[PDB]
Every structure is written in C-alpha cells, then in structure tokens.
A paper describes a structure:
Here, I present the crystal structure of the Tof1–Csm3 complex from Chaetomium thermophilum at 3.1 Å resolution. The only construct of the complex resulting in diffracting crystals was Tof1(1–728)ΔL1,2,3–Csm3(48–157). Here, three predicted disordered loops were deleted from Tof1: L1 (256–363), L2 (420–434), L3 (558–585). However, in contrast to this domain, the helical bundle of Csm3 is flattened such that it no longer has a hydrophobic core and thus does not appear to be an independently folded structure and rather acts as a cap on the C-terminus of Tof1. The interface between the two is largely hydrophobic with some salt bridges, and consists of a large percentage of Csm3, showing why both proteins are required to stabilize each other. α25 and α26 from Arm-8 plus the following helix α27 contain all the interaction sites for Csm3. As previously noted, there is a highly conserved cleft within this interior towards the N-terminus of Tof1, lined with basic and hydrophobic residues. In our structure, the purification tag of a symmetry copy occupies this cleft.
Additionally it has an important role in protecting stalled forks and enabling their restart, coupling the replicative helicases and polymerases, promoting fork progression, mediating the S phase checkpoint and maintaining genome stability at CAG repeats. The mammalian orthologue of Tof1–Csm3 is the Timeless–Tipin complex, which has similar functions and additionally regulates the fork in response to oxidative stress. The structure reveals that, instead of containing distinct domains, the entire complex forms an extended alpha-helical repeat protein.
Residue numbers in the entry:
A (entry chain A): -13 to -2, 3 to 195, 204 to 428, 441 to 574
B (entry chain B): 69 to 152
Amino acid sequence: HHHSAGLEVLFQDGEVNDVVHPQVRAHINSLVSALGGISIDDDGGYKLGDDALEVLRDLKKWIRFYDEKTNRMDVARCLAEANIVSTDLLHILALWTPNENSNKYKARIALACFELMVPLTWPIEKDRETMTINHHRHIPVLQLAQLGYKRAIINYDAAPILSTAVRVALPAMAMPIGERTARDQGIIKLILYFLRNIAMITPPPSQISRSALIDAFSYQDIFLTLLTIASNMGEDFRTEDVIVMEIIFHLVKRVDPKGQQLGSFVSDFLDSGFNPLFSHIRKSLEREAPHVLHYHQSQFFYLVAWFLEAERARRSSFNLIASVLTQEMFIALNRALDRAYGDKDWRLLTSAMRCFTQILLTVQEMFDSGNDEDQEIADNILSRLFYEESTHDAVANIVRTYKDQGFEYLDACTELAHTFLRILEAYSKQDEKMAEKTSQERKFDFKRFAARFTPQGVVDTFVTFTKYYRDLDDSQLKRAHRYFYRVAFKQEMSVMLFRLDIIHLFYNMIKGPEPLDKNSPMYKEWEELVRQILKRCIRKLEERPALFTEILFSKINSTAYYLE
Amino acid sequence: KLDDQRLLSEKGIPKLRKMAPRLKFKGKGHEFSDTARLLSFYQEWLDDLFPKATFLDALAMVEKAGHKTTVRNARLKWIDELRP
C-alpha cells in the first residue's frame, strides 16, 4: 500500500438519534443550562440561574413522574451525559458557605441539590421484575456515571460537599424527636442516605477510592456526625439505626479491624456508640420493624463480627461490647441460623457464622482477662454453651452438609467448627473426691461433642477447603492443619482421612506441581503432618488388606471402627 | 448406570485383591515415594477401566458409585475375608 485508505474516517449532534426520548434530552438540557453557569469574567466564579430553585424542583419532578412512574431511565441518562452532579450541582453547593447558612434561599437550593443527588447516586439492582429493556440498556452507563459522581464529590477542591450535606440536616437534627415533623425527619433520612450512597459506590466486578473515602470522611467531620447519631440512638433518634449502620458497613468494606486508617474512629465508636446502636438494631429485628429490610440482618452480623475483632486489637475494656454478649443475642442468632438454612439463604448464614465465631473468640479472651467481673461472665456464658445441644447439633449439621455454597461460606463454617472445638477444649479441663466428680465429667461430654465432627461429611468439607492451599493465608492453613491433627489425635487413627482423592492432595501439596513454598512457616508444620498421616496409611494397608478395596470413603462410622 | 457398570461387571475389583499384595512395593522409611508408587498403581488401573478421563475426575466417580445399594452388598463381601 502506497496511498491512504478512504475508510479511515469515522462516524459523527441533532441529525443523529439517541437511545433516550429525543424530546426528553431537549427538555433536560433546557433545565441544566437554566440552573446556572461559570462566569466569563476572570475570578468571577459561578453565576447561579435566576429560576434555579424552580428548575431544580422541575428536575426532581422529571425523575419521580417520568422515570419512576412510567418505568423508564431516560432523564437519568440525560443528567449523566450532562454530568450536573459533577459540573453544576457541586458549584451551587459551594456558594452556601458556613457563614452563609443563615440564607434561607441558599439553604433551600442546597437541599434541592441533595433531593436530586440522592436518586442519581442511588445503588441499582439489575435483578428486578420492574426492570425493562429500557433499564438494562442505560444501567451500564449510569453505573459508570455514578463512579464519576463519587470521584467529583470526594475530590472537590473548592468546597466540602459531605460537610455541606451534614449542615442541611443539622438544624432538624438539633430539635427533639417528638418536635420533629415528617418533613424534618425526611431531611435527616435524605442526608444519611446520601452518605451511604457515596460509600456504596465501587466499580462492578481500585484501592485509592477506598482510601480517599476514609480521608474525606474524617476531615469533613462525618465520622464525628456518625458517632453523635449512634451514641444517642435511644433518645433523639430511632428508625435511622439501620441507615447509620449501612454507612459504617460500606466503610468497613474490605477493611482490616486491626491497625487501620480509621483508627481514630474505631476507639471512639466502641467507647460511645457501640452498645446503644447495636442494641437498638437487635430490638428492631426482633420486633420485625417496618423500616428494617432483609439485607440489614446480614449487615448487622458482619459489623458485630468486625467491631469484636477491632475491640481485641485495643482491649481497653471488655464491657464496651456487653450488648452483643447478652443471652438475648444468643437466642436471636440461633433462630437466625435455623431460618437461614431452611430458606436456603447462605449470605445471611455466612455473616451469622462469622459473627458467632467472633463472640466465642471474645469469651475466650475474657476468660484470661484481668477484670474479675469479666472472668465471671465469660464462665457463665461458656457453662451454657458446653451443655446446649440445640446449638451443638445445628453447627455440626452445617459443616456436614456442603454443596456449591461458595468459598466465603466455606471459610465461615470451617472458622466456626475449628473455634467451637478449641474454646470448649479449654473448658474441658478447667473434698478432693467431690471436686473431681464435677471437673472430670466434662471430658466425657467433650468426646461426645467432638464425635459430631468425625463423619465423612465434615471430613470432605475440610478436604475441599484444603484444596485452596495456594491462596490460603497462614491462619487459614492453621484451621485445616489443626483439624486433621485433631483426627489422628482423637485416637480415630485417621481412618476417615484414608481415601485416594484425600491422599492425592496431601502429597502434591508438599512434593508435586504446587510446592506450597518451602520458606512458609506453615509448610514445615504441614510437611511433618502429611508424613505422619502417610506413615499410618502404609501401616494400615499391611495390617488390613480390605483397606485397598475400601479406599472409596463411601463407608460410615461403624465400618471405620472395625478398621481401627 | 451404564458408565458405573465397569464396577458392577467385577473386572476391576478382583484385580484390587490380586494385584495389591502381588507388587509388595512398600517401604516404611519413605512416605512420599511409597505413596507415589501407590498413586501410579491406581492411575494405571483407572486408565485400563476407562481411558481419556482426568485422574481427579475419575476418583470422584468411584466414591459416588460406592454409595449404591448393589455396590454396598458387593463391598461387604471383601471385609468378610479378613474375619477368622
């Protein structure tokens, strides 16, 4: 080729049609221009529109009566392409300075901005009956537009938008709960939902967006605002308990509870707003409140589990988390465990199991705690847990029955099974004839309890967990190590472990395609473990020749005892 | 099942009672080399039973077949040979 190809030119504007209603795009653009614009004069700033208040109210009408009522997403897409939530609305909120909060007109236009920003930054759920061919077309663009909104709100150089949001609700937040009208309670809800919306926004499946969110929250005193609402959850507040919980849930999302950026907030939250907030949410779920939703239940269990781990990183006082260690919580999560399994809800069960694991880890640290009252309460909780067979038979059945439930569920159940055995083992140990009768009787009860983890179902679930050894961390490998170590050190002779598929995995784990890295601290413990299991494997084939044919593992606990 | 009939046919199982002590490939000192000879012995048997099948996928098909009522009655025959 010597000359240029004519097809190199691309495709091109009013003459070409769009996916939205052509008249909607014109109407929405008539409003986005009329609300204002940047001053042509140098250092002039932002010229607010003459009828800016009414056009903002008209844009809110276009969302409620055209998009919502008719099940369309045209005005949503129009505002996304106009990018007002990033180019116009941010400049309008910048005009309402802290000294200018007395301006009634400037405060009303500021509210109208959030009355528009909340539905636009609202999270979208693809799987809905109401969704049409229209919604599914626009959603990919809107989801990306929502990321562009969050980026502009967090990184706005001129004015603090999140701090400005707090100021809108602040006067209606000062007045008592009884004195608050339906309008005044709506402003608190709108502003609290705005903070949740921006914290919710993440790309559909970067870490800088997670870091900048925490940095903007502390600087613009939102963590201080969240603490004041949570600490006064009894008087002056109600219903908002789940909305505040959701904000903190989307903040602790993929965040470590020990040595974090939000280290300043975690200590202040446990000291003031832990018990009043989490006791209210517990009571809200029990009474089956109208404001509470099904997804709020699993989020509650996640936050309890997250803050319990965050508490042990400081452990200033084990009394600051007293509300979640009450017997009322125990009855509630036990009923939640039975209900989630029956309804086949695994996401709720995963959060409940992880919550329960953190509660058991807390009572163990309270047993060795310096506080006299802490050891008294830890022992009375453990006394009930050691004999409550209703909880025992339920936890044992979960690990026994596992089929295509996901790795998050697998990591949660194996966490609970390992800890429940470990914590009760400590209780199993700690005039002479009278004291021994009650102390040595617990050793009989523990061997009965540990026999629930011996069947094939529990074994296979731990085996499938061990398969992910290439991705598992040091603590994750300890669970699998201590379970198999507990099989041989149960006097069970690891008859259950003898299966071709199980023996295959253990071998290539140390010496095969994936060497598990020889430099790892867990490798040396595993190498010693696998060798000990294989030592008994070769010996049992010589002892009984039936093991060659019965390597199928399809056997039960009665046929396994015959082999040992 | 027609695919699980290879176990029902009694061609693979009578070789597991005849070929296993026949090799005598056991060393108490080594764990890895002894289990590698064991894995190579079963991999050979699985290839002769049904070729063009993954090793890990083959083992899982054997245990599922073992749970069957017809197979369970046949497996209980092998354990009786041990009793005096």
